Amino acid sequence: AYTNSFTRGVYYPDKVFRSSVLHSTQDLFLPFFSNVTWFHAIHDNPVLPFNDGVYFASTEKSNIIRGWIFGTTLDSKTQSLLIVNNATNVVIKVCEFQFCNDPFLGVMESEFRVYSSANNCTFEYVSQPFLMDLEGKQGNFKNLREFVFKNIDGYFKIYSKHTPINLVRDLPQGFSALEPLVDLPIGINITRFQTLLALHAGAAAYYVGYLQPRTFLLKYNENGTITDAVDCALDPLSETKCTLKSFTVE
Amino acid sequence: LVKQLSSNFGAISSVLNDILSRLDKVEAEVQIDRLITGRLQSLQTYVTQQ
Amino acid sequence: LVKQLSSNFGAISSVLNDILSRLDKVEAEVQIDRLITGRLQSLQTYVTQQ
Amino acid sequence: KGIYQTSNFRVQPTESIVRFPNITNLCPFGEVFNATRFASVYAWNRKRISNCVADYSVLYNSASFSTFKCYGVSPTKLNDLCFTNVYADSFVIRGDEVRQIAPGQTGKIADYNYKLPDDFTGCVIAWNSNNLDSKVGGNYNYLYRLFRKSNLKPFERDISTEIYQAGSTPCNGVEGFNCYFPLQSYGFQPTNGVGYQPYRVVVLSFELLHAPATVCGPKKSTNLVKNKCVNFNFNGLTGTGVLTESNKKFLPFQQFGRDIADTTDAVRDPQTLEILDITPCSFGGVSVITPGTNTSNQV
Amino acid sequence: NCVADYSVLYNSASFSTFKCYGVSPTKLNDLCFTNVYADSFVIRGDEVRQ
Numbered sequence: 001a002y003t004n005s006f007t008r009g010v011y012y013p014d015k016v017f018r019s020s021v022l023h024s025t026q027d028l029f030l031p032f033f034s035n036v037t038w039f040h041a042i043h044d045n046p047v048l049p050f051n052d053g054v055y056f057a058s059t060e061k062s063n064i065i066r067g068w069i070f071g072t073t074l075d076s077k078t079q080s081l082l083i084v085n086n087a088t089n090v091v092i093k094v095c096e097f098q099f100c101n102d103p104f105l106g107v108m109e110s111e112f113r114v115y116s117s118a119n120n121c122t123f124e125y126v127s128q129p130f131l132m133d134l135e136g137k138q139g140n141f142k143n144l145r146e147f148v149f150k151n152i153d154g155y156f157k158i159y160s161k162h163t164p165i166n167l168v169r170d171l172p173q174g175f176s177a178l179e180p181l182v183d184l185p186i187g188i189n190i191t192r193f194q195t196l197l198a199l200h201a202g203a204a205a206y207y208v209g210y211l212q213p214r215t216f217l218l219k220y221n222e223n224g225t226i227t228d229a230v231d232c233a234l235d236p237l238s239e240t241k242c243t244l245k246s247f248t249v250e
Numbered sequence: 251l252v253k254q255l256s257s258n259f260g261a262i263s264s265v266l267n268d269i270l271s272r273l274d275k276v277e278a279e280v281q282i283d284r285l286i287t288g289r290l291q292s293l294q295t296y297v298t299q300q
Numbered sequence: 301l302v303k304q305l306s307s308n309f310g311a312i313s314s315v316l317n318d319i320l321s322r323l324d325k326v327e328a329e330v331q332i333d334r335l336i337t338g339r340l341q342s343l344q345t346y347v348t349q350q
Numbered sequence: 351k352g353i354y355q356t357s358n359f360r361v362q363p364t365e366s367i368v369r370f371p372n373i374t375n376l377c378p379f380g381e382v383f384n385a386t387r388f389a390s391v392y393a394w395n396r397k398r399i400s401n402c403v404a405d406y407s408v409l410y411n412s413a414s415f416s417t418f419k420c421y422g423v424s425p426t427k428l429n430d431l432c433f434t435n436v437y438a439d440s441f442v443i444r445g446d447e448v449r450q451i452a453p454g455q456t457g458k459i460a461d462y463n464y465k466l467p468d469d470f471t472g473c474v475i476a477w478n479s480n481n482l483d484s485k486v487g488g489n490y491n492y493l494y495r496l497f498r499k500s501n502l503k504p505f506e507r508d509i510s511t512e513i514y515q516a517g518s519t520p521c522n523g524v525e526g527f528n529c530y531f532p533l534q535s536y537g538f539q540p541t542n543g544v545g546y547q548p549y550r551v552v553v554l555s556f557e558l559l560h561a562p563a564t565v566c567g568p569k570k571s572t573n574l575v576k577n578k579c580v581n582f583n584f585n586g587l588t589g590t591g592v593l594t595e596s597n598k599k600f601l602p603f604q605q606f607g608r609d610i611a612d613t614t615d616a617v618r619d620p621q622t623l624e625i626l627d628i629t630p631c632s633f634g635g636v637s638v639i640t641p642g643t644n645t646s647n648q649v
Numbered sequence: 650n651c652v653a654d655y656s657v658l659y660n661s662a663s664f665s666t667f668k669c670y671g672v673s674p675t676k677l678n679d680l681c682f683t684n685v686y687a688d689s690f691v692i693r694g695d696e697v698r699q
């Protein structure tokens with residue numbers, strides 16, 4: 001179905017420290033109170049368009065969502081970025097992958113069915129080892145993990161934030177800014193993407209939003225953390241706030 | 251103030267659309283900058299007099 | 301007035317030291333002239349309003 | 351008789367502070383410029399250069415390059431400047447097309463196989479390869495794309511081999527009218543003309559600071575002195591001021607702080623990850639209080 | 650009294666020089682004129698710059 005995006009999709013536009021200042025920046029952000037599509041993985045992983053950047057978020061309890069596929073035709077005819085989280089090592093590859101009829105990371109794990117061929121590859125990266133959830137579990141979710149994926153002039157920029165939550169039905173109300181983590185120079189024309197769910201079915205949910213060029217007024221507190229924000233095109237009051245560069249209007 | 255829109259200020263043409271429709275970006279940005287400087291100066295003069 | 305120090309005025313960067321530390325003299329003098337014109341105009345506007 | 355404001359006292363620095371990452375490695379430029387085989391321009395290679403000490407004076411002063419053109423930066427400052435990453439886009443082009451590898455330029459190559467950003471910062475390096483890549487009976491290993499549906503955005507690598515439909519007729523791999531292949535090649539021969547000889551071109555894309563730097567020029571660091579007016583250089587960003595201790599909790603990804611005017615407020619030292627506030631050294635106007643010179647010259 | 654196409658002449662890899670004033674070579678497909686005159690003659694190579 002769909003839900004109302006409640007104060008989400010804001011990331012640090014750059015890596016410069018500021019504090020006790022409201023700084024105005026124009027970049028690709030998720031508009032406030034926009035509609036975001038609600039997907040279920042009980043009793044799916046369809047392909048969505050990739051366009052102007054994508055906001056992705058998920059709530060987890062058993063690490064069902066483990067990866068992403070990005071590209072144009074996704075059929076070994078063009079280059080396609082592949083990100084896989086296999087509970088130990090994060091694997092990033094940029095190959096002309098031949099994908100399976102139903103890509104998934106099924107369960108412990110003994111199936112790796114997301115692709116079948118990898119030829120004419122131009123990039124590979126692997127992070128450090130670790131351990132992750134691999135058992136099918138139930139209950140209220142504990143960690144909401146928000147991501148931003150955008151491609152500007154060949155650089156695929158990934159931002160993310162992990163936070164504890166205690167809420168299953170919808171997005172928690174509150175405010176949280178997304179820090180940058182990864183910047184991959186790939187140069188691939190990406191028009192569609194798909195997520196990867198771990199199937200035993202699952203019981204988790206994820207959210208897909210889309211970014212638009214909007215101007216935001218970001219409030220940095222004394223600790224240099226963004227604590228509030230104004231979506232300058234949300235409504236006339238936000239426009240007024242942008243004009244006066246203040247959150248209080250006389 | 252309105253009459254000032256007719257001035258070239260060193261540009262090939264006073265009409266902004268006529269610059270944009272015939273030259274590509276690199277040099278056109280220079281020709282546009284010439285008009286922006288002149289027209290911005292015209293507004294500042296108007297506001298000061300007001 | 302202080303906010304105006306953040307403007308490029310057509311230069312590659314608003315930070316004067318960042319221009320001087322990466323480009324040699326000949327073209328850098330041009331980039332600096334762009335900032336001088338813009339910042340000098342900003343001061344004149346401030347003084348007139350005062 | 352009166353008080354006049356005549357000058358400005360400004361404390362001058364006493365010593366310089368030069369700070370760079372403590373890396374003891376040289377950048378592998380020899381394995382890229384002196385390579386056994388270059389990639390084709392339709393499938394140009396992009397090698398990442400990082401975590402090393404570079405020296406751009408050797409490449410610039412060497413009398414072997416056919417062209418050495420830099421945007422955003424000047425060739426003699428590269429020894430001082432340092433970067434988060436450097437990318438080397440390596441491919442072979444035809445000589446008369448060297449002019450097309452540039453921001454703001456258009457043509458069949460600039461638009462179909464290698465497009466640069468119009469704000470590109472970096473250097474275009476080229477030299478002829480008539481005695482290495484060209485062969486007798488011609489070199490047919492260099493393919494470029496002649497036909498594309500759209501024009502390339504900057505730094506897209508269109509490796510596709512899909513057959514061009516020059517009309518409404520579907521081709522599905524046929525080579526006839528209204529059905530041509532996008533891939534074409536050059537026959538480079540030692541007897542061909544200057545403009546038709548192969549050239550090896552490497553474009554060096556430089557990312558100014560926004561993150562911890564890993565590729566810095568050949569400059570030794572010095573010790574850091576606090577609470578004194580100094581002329582500092584932190585990863586190539588220079589200025590004058592007093593460096594003091596701070597309580598600003600930078601996030602692991604933040605390297606520099608800024609004021610309203612975009613001047614540097616604080617820096618994180620690249621060798622020891624602590625935050626230093628930069629307060630410009632004390633200054634102020636100087637006024638002279640004097641009786642008129644018809645009475646006394648004491649002030 | 651005709652429809653011109655300046656992309657063929659510009660993209661063709663046969664001309665020694667192609668230098669335009671007032672207009673940019675990629676905009677000529679959009680632009681139109683009351684008349685065009687072709688001044689045709691042979692010169693010596695080093696004099697092309699003249």
Ligand SMILES: *[C@@H]1O[C@H](CO)[C@@H](O)[C@H](O)[C@H]1NC(C)=O
Pocket residue numbers: 002003004033034035036
């Ligand atoms: C989102 O879309 C659904 C159906 O398209 C609609 O029922 C819902 O009210 C929308 N929400 C918002 C906030 O527009």
Ligand SMILES: *[C@@H]1O[C@H](CO)[C@@H](O)[C@H](O)[C@H]1NC(C)=O
Pocket residue numbers: 084086087088089091109112
């Ligand atoms: C997951 O797949 C990656 C892909 O190379 C592999 O390196 C890793 O060992 C796999 N993890 C397993 C099987 O637990």
Ligand SMILES: *[C@@H]1O[C@H](CO)[C@@H](O)[C@H](O)[C@H]1NC(C)=O
Pocket residue numbers: 076096119120
């Ligand atoms: C990859 O490169 C080889 C180079 O010989 C080429 O033959 C092949 O068609 C390309 N594409 C794929 C999918 O292998």
Ligand SMILES: *[C@@H]1O[C@H](CO)[C@@H](O)[C@H](O)[C@H]1NC(C)=O
Pocket residue numbers: 221222223
């Ligand atoms: C800033 O950080 C300090 C760290 O001790 C904390 O005590 C303070 O509360 C923070 N600021 C705010 C507004 O919470």
Ligand SMILES: *[C@@H]1O[C@H](CO)[C@@H](O)[C@H](O)[C@H]1NC(C)=O
Pocket residue numbers: 372373374621
């Ligand atoms: C890092 O910098 C410090 C500065 O004194 C130096 O002692 C240390 O050896 C450097 N690290 C390496 C690996 O050289």
Ligand SMILES: *[C@@H]1O[C@H](CO)[C@@H](O)[C@H](O)[C@H]1NC(C)=O
Pocket residue numbers: 379380381383384
């Ligand atoms: C390439 O090789 C030549 C001679 O073999 C050498 O003089 C030159 O310095 C080399 N280039 C680099 C970048 O090492």
Ligand SMILES: *[C@@H]1O[C@H](CO)[C@@H](O)[C@H](O)[C@H]1NC(C)=O
Pocket residue numbers: 072189190191500501502503506
């Ligand atoms: C990217 O691929 C899409 C096909 O989905 C195509 O329409 C678009 O033109 C491509 N981008 C470029 C720059 O060619």
Ligand SMILES: *[C@@H]1O[C@H](CO)[C@@H](O)[C@H](O)[C@H]1NC(C)=O
Pocket residue numbers: 644645
């Ligand atoms: C200033 O100088 C003039 C000329 O020397 C002298 O006549 C006048 O008295 C002086 N003023 C005072 C206050 O002494």
